[PDB]
Design an enzyme around this catalytic site. Structure first.
Site, PDB file in Angstrom:
ATOM      1  N   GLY A 168       7.310   4.988   1.736  1.00  0.00           N
ATOM      2  CA  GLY A 168       7.745   6.207   2.396  1.00  0.00           C
ATOM      3  C   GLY A 168       9.255   6.270   2.468  1.00  0.00           C
ATOM      4  O   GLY A 168       9.830   6.739   3.451  1.00  0.00           O
ATOM      5  N   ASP A 228       2.930  18.241  11.826  1.00  0.00           N
ATOM      6  CA  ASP A 228       2.887  17.985  10.390  1.00  0.00           C
ATOM      7  C   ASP A 228       1.618  17.272   9.958  1.00  0.00           C
ATOM      8  O   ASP A 228       1.640  16.118   9.547  1.00  0.00           O
ATOM      9  CB  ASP A 228       4.109  17.174   9.951  1.00  0.00           C
ATOM     10  CG  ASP A 228       4.191  17.013   8.430  1.00  0.00           C
ATOM     11  OD1 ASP A 228       3.383  17.658   7.717  1.00  0.00           O
ATOM     12  OD2 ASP A 228       5.062  16.243   7.950  1.00  0.00           O
ATOM     13  N   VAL A 261       4.327  -0.296   3.612  1.00  0.00           N
ATOM     14  CA  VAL A 261       3.151  -0.799   4.308  1.00  0.00           C
ATOM     15  C   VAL A 261       2.500  -1.854   3.419  1.00  0.00           C
ATOM     16  O   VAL A 261       2.406  -1.688   2.203  1.00  0.00           O
ATOM     17  CB  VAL A 261       2.124   0.336   4.617  1.00  0.00           C
ATOM     18  CG1 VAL A 261       1.119  -0.147   5.656  1.00  0.00           C
ATOM     19  CG2 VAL A 261       2.836   1.578   5.115  1.00  0.00           C
ATOM     20  N   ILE A 290       0.842  -1.171   0.000  1.00  0.00           N
ATOM     21  CA  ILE A 290       0.000   0.000   0.000  1.00  0.00           C
ATOM     22  C   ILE A 290       0.881   1.225   0.000  1.00  0.00           C
ATOM     23  O   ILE A 290       1.077   1.875  -1.027  1.00  0.00           O
ATOM     24  CB  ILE A 290      -0.857   0.037   1.237  1.00  0.00           C
ATOM     25  CG1 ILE A 290      -1.684  -1.244   1.322  1.00  0.00           C
ATOM     26  CG2 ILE A 290      -1.725   1.264   1.204  1.00  0.00           C
ATOM     27  CD1 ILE A 290      -2.246  -1.529   2.710  1.00  0.00           C
ATOM     28  N   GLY A 291       1.431   1.527   1.165  1.00  0.00           N
ATOM     29  CA  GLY A 291       2.255   2.709   1.292  1.00  0.00           C
ATOM     30  C   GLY A 291       3.717   2.469   0.975  1.00  0.00           C
ATOM     31  O   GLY A 291       4.241   1.369   1.163  1.00  0.00           O
TER      32      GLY A 291
HETATM   33  C1  LIG Z   1       6.076   4.670   5.276  1.00  0.00           C
HETATM   34  C2  LIG Z   1       4.611   4.985   5.589  1.00  0.00           C
HETATM   35  C3  LIG Z   1       4.404   6.242   6.445  1.00  0.00           C
HETATM   36  C4  LIG Z   1       5.547   7.068   6.912  1.00  0.00           C
HETATM   37  C5  LIG Z   1       5.335   8.174   7.663  1.00  0.00           C
HETATM   38  C6  LIG Z   1       3.964   8.581   8.028  1.00  0.00           C
HETATM   39  C7  LIG Z   1       2.892   7.849   7.618  1.00  0.00           C
HETATM   40  C8  LIG Z   1       1.449   8.260   7.987  1.00  0.00           C
HETATM   41  C9  LIG Z   1       1.329   9.537   8.846  1.00  0.00           C
HETATM   42  C10 LIG Z   1       3.138   6.608   6.777  1.00  0.00           C
HETATM   43  N1  LIG Z   1       2.086   5.801   6.318  1.00  0.00           N
HETATM   44  C11 LIG Z   1       1.554   4.783   6.996  1.00  0.00           C
HETATM   45  O1  LIG Z   1       2.029   4.400   8.076  1.00  0.00           O
HETATM   46  C12 LIG Z   1       0.416   4.154   6.396  1.00  0.00           C
HETATM   47  N2  LIG Z   1       0.109   4.350   5.174  1.00  0.00           N
HETATM   48  N3  LIG Z   1      -1.006   3.638   4.910  1.00  0.00           N
HETATM   49  C13 LIG Z   1      -1.650   3.617   3.623  1.00  0.00           C
HETATM   50  C14 LIG Z   1      -1.405   2.954   6.074  1.00  0.00           C
HETATM   51  C15 LIG Z   1      -0.537   3.257   7.012  1.00  0.00           C
HETATM   52  C16 LIG Z   1      -0.575   2.719   8.409  1.00  0.00           C
HETATM   53  C17 LIG Z   1      -1.741   1.680   8.632  1.00  0.00           C
HETATM   54  C18 LIG Z   1      -2.751   1.512   7.476  1.00  0.00           C
HETATM   55  C19 LIG Z   1      -3.949   0.684   7.636  1.00  0.00           C
HETATM   56  N4  LIG Z   1      -4.757   0.533   6.642  1.00  0.00           N
HETATM   57  C20 LIG Z   1      -4.509   1.164   5.379  1.00  0.00           C
HETATM   58  N5  LIG Z   1      -5.380   1.019   4.276  1.00  0.00           N
HETATM   59  C21 LIG Z   1      -5.291   1.575   2.956  1.00  0.00           C
HETATM   60  C22 LIG Z   1      -5.112   3.033   2.655  1.00  0.00           C
HETATM   61  C23 LIG Z   1      -5.066   3.464   1.362  1.00  0.00           C
HETATM   62  C24 LIG Z   1      -5.199   2.483   0.256  1.00  0.00           C
HETATM   63  C25 LIG Z   1      -5.201   2.917  -1.123  1.00  0.00           C
HETATM   64  O2  LIG Z   1      -6.211   2.645  -1.808  1.00  0.00           O
HETATM   65  N6  LIG Z   1      -4.175   3.610  -1.644  1.00  0.00           N
HETATM   66  C26 LIG Z   1      -4.230   4.127  -3.011  1.00  0.00           C
HETATM   67  C27 LIG Z   1      -2.813   4.624  -3.437  1.00  0.00           C
HETATM   68  C28 LIG Z   1      -2.876   5.288  -4.847  1.00  0.00           C
HETATM   69  N7  LIG Z   1      -3.880   6.404  -4.841  1.00  0.00           N
HETATM   70  C29 LIG Z   1      -3.880   7.079  -6.158  1.00  0.00           C
HETATM   71  C30 LIG Z   1      -5.263   5.901  -4.539  1.00  0.00           C
HETATM   72  C31 LIG Z   1      -5.286   5.291  -3.116  1.00  0.00           C
HETATM   73  C32 LIG Z   1      -5.345   1.176   0.528  1.00  0.00           C
HETATM   74  C33 LIG Z   1      -5.393   0.700   1.951  1.00  0.00           C
HETATM   75  O3  LIG Z   1      -5.545  -0.660   2.336  1.00  0.00           O
HETATM   76  C34 LIG Z   1      -6.598  -1.417   1.767  1.00  0.00           C
HETATM   77  F1  LIG Z   1      -6.155  -1.954   0.569  1.00  0.00           F
HETATM   78  F2  LIG Z   1      -6.994  -2.442   2.624  1.00  0.00           F
HETATM   79  F3  LIG Z   1      -7.697  -0.612   1.533  1.00  0.00           F
HETATM   80  N8  LIG Z   1      -3.478   1.889   5.233  1.00  0.00           N
HETATM   81  C35 LIG Z   1      -2.557   2.093   6.275  1.00  0.00           C
END
Ligand SMILES: CCc1cccc(CC)c1NC(=O)c1nn(C)c2c1CCc1cnc(Nc3ccc(C(=O)NC4CCN(C)CC4)cc3OC(F)(F)F)nc1-2
Ligand SMILES: CCc1cccc(CC)c1NC(=O)c1nn(C)c2c1CCc1cnc(Nc3ccc(C(=O)NC4CCN(C)CC4)cc3OC(F)(F)F)nc1-2
Lengths: 253, 253
Positions: free
Chosen positions: B20, B133, B25, B17-18
């Site tokens: 960074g 932030d 993630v 998913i993510g």
């Molecule tokens: C390295 C990551 C990081 C570093 C620093 C800070 C932070 C957050 C403050 C983070 N970032 C993170 O720590 C972080 N980023 N994401 C995305 C998640 C997390 C933590 C838990 C978490 C729990 N559930 C999800 N669900 C979903 C969130 C978004 C999408 C998604 O559809 N993304 C697409 C990407 C492309 N664009 C164009 C359309 C949307 C799919 C997801 O899971 C599902 F599949 F089950 F739905 N995500 C996360």
């Protein structure tokens, strides 16, 4: 196919080149079928403040004409309450494009460019004028000679911005920075801070003493030196244009 | 099809998913075929400084679990000298996307969101923690409930940045700004300073008292008020979270 009257004399647009919001630049064809550039500026929303800035810049450019070949020529102008038309030489392309499109710099072609830029900045510097916003765009390539386009008086990255303009929340030394970034790019293929993605991360970098601008060893050590001296964060330390004109990089081999 | 061991228990990646940088993630599938998220962080280049920041953040999140439903759940974690794995709930999508993809906000769905965010920021605020932030990304949508994702302790626009972080060349009041931009966007369809193109032009705006943030009249005047109060440049003037919890916009109709 349309035209423009400037001081009663007429030019036919051939194509639009620049856009800058309330301003446009056109390549045009004059009476004797010679080709020119016309900068056009809309003064609808112009407030007296904004207004005089333009007045000032015109005066200066116009004035600084017979001081340096490395400033764009200004052939004639019309000015009224609603607009300005300026008739300037038409060039081949601007430095920034030539950069985007170009992926190789004859080390020798780089040197001449630097040489030109310095002469120009120097000139405007010898007149109280400090541009403060220099980027490859502000220069124009005309038969492998560069001209400066404007003086930064009137009126989108942070890249070429100097530490000190940031600690601001005005010195000739501020133009050296920029000037050197433009050299840096030319040299290490890019600006000193493009690496940094985060637009605030880049602001901190630009000001933090402990960040090392990276200086990759290369054939030319003159050049290497120069950039090292131009990018000295403390302005009082930074090299000056009179010094830079007298550095080996421009002087010897 | 590949897997991950976290505290000796195993999950199969289903998709990434993510990203960074030094972190990824994954949506994953656990033993009992339930679905989770795992944040992964590489500690290769981690210097003790950077290192403890991560240690701190883990401790806090982990701790602040049983204080607020509006912070992401952290089910388990593994931590070693080279990496961290955290097992958190998997949500449907993050706020920023839902925003990009969404082009209509039930005024009522907006309100709940704001409500959630406030509860969250408040919680972390009640613990010395100031995120500093905040952007739609830091929140997660889980059955129309938003969670906060991280605390802004560890480790790309300037938009949500407050005047005061700029005059910096640290107050809870700084989170209100951001919080309000995120509301603003939700409301006038975009952030308060997207208009401004020039990345330094935007910096000056964000700090100049005489620039008017534009506030278009709309049905809801509560909402209008709120945003006006959240975007007050002087922090000492800006509304506080305890006040914002007690404003009509959240309280009455
Ligand atoms: C390295 C990551 C990081 C570093 C620093 C800070 C932070 C957050 C403050 C983070 N970032 C993170 O720590 C972080 N980023 N994401 C995305 C998640 C997390 C933590 C838990 C978490 C729990 N559930 C999800 N669900 C979903 C969130 C978004 C999408 C998604 O559809 N993304 C697409 C990407 C492309 N664009 C164009 C359309 C949307 C799919 C997801 O899971 C599902 F599949 F089950 F739905 N995500 C996360
Ligand atoms: C509103 C304008 C403005 C406001 C503030 C400040 C400044 C300059 C500091 C300016 N900007 C300006 O005042 C300004 N902008 N340009 C482009 C020129 C000027 C002044 C005179 C001038 C004289 N000759 C030229 N020649 C040309 C320069 C570039 C191109 C060109 O090829 N552009 C392409 C655009 C798309 N990219 C992808 C590839 C390159 C074509 C040109 O004329 C030719 F056709 F004869 F070659 N240009 C200009």
């Amino acid at each position: 196919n349309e035209c423009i009257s400037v001081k009663g004399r007429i030019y036919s647009i051939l194509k639009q080149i620049g856009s800058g919001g309330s301003s446009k630049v056109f390549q045009v064809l004059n009476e004797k079928k010679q080709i020119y550039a016309i900068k056009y500026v809309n003064l609808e929303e112009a407030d007296n403040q904004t207004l005089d800035s333009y007045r000032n810049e015109i005066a200066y450019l116009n004035k600084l004409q017979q001081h340096s070949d490395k400033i764009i020529r200004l052939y004639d102008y019309e000015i009224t309450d609603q607009y300005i038309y300026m008739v300037m030489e038409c060039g081949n392309i601007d430095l920034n494009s030539w950069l985007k499109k170009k992926k190789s710099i004859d080390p020798w072609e780089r040197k001449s460019y630097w040489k030109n830029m310095l002469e120009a900045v120097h000139t405007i510097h010898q007149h109280g004028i400090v541009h403060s916003d220099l980027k490859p765009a502000n220069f124009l390539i005309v038969d492998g000679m560069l001209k400066l386009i404007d003086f930064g008086i009137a009126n989108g990255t942070v890249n070429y911005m100097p530490p000190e303009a940031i600690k601001d929340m005005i010195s000739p030394k501020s133009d050296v920075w920029s000037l050197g970034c433009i050299l840096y790019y030319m040299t290490y293929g890019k600006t000193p801070f493009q690496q940094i993605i985060n637009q605030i991360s880049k602001l901190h970098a630009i000001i933090d003493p402990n960040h090392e601008i990276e200086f990759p060893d290369i054939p030319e050590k003159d050049l290497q030196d120069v950039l090292k001296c131009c990018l000295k964060r403390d302005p009082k330390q930074r090299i000056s244009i009179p010094e830079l004109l007298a550095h080996p990089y421009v002087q010897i081999q």
